Amino acid sequence: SPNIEAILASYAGFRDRDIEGILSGMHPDVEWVHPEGMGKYGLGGTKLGHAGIKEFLAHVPTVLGGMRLAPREFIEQGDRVVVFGTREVTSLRGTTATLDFVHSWTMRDGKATRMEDIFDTVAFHELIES
Ligand SMILES: O=C1C(O)=C(c2ccccc2)[C@H](O)C(O)=C1c1ccccc1
């Protein structure tokens, strides 16, 4: 399916620490959204476009030692896809946790116009501070 394979190309880019692969599913106008409760670490709110994603990704190593995604379920209807999964998150002190994620994708002409990450920010903060 065409929306799904563009989403997978992006997840593959993340797996391979490959920004070009990540953007290979994103529209230039894409909206990149993370919970407002990550504002304390400078990772909340909306970033715009390919440049905004790079800004976000350049900040992450300031907060975390590592992250690995495991998408598990894809629910699709139209230009919307919701992906449920887990991720391994490593703190700057080497502590590692498995946490849940939901990615809500909005597509058009085969690329993402919006990707929003929704997750338990308290549990995430607890990992960051451990
Ligand atoms: O690129 C990230 C990112 O770096 C993550 C993150 C890091 C720190 C705090 C909150 C989220 C997400 O784990 C993560 O799903 C993404 C991602 C989503 C879709 C395609 C490619 C990558």
Automatic annotation (TrEMBL):
**SnoaL-like domain boundaries:** 9-115
Give the superkingdom in one word: Bacteria
Q: What is the protein named? A: TerC
Organism (species): Streptomyces
Tell me the organism's taxonomic lineage. Answer: Bacteria, Bacillati, Actinomycetota, Actinomycetes, Kitasatosporales
Section covered of the full-length record: 33 to 162 of 162
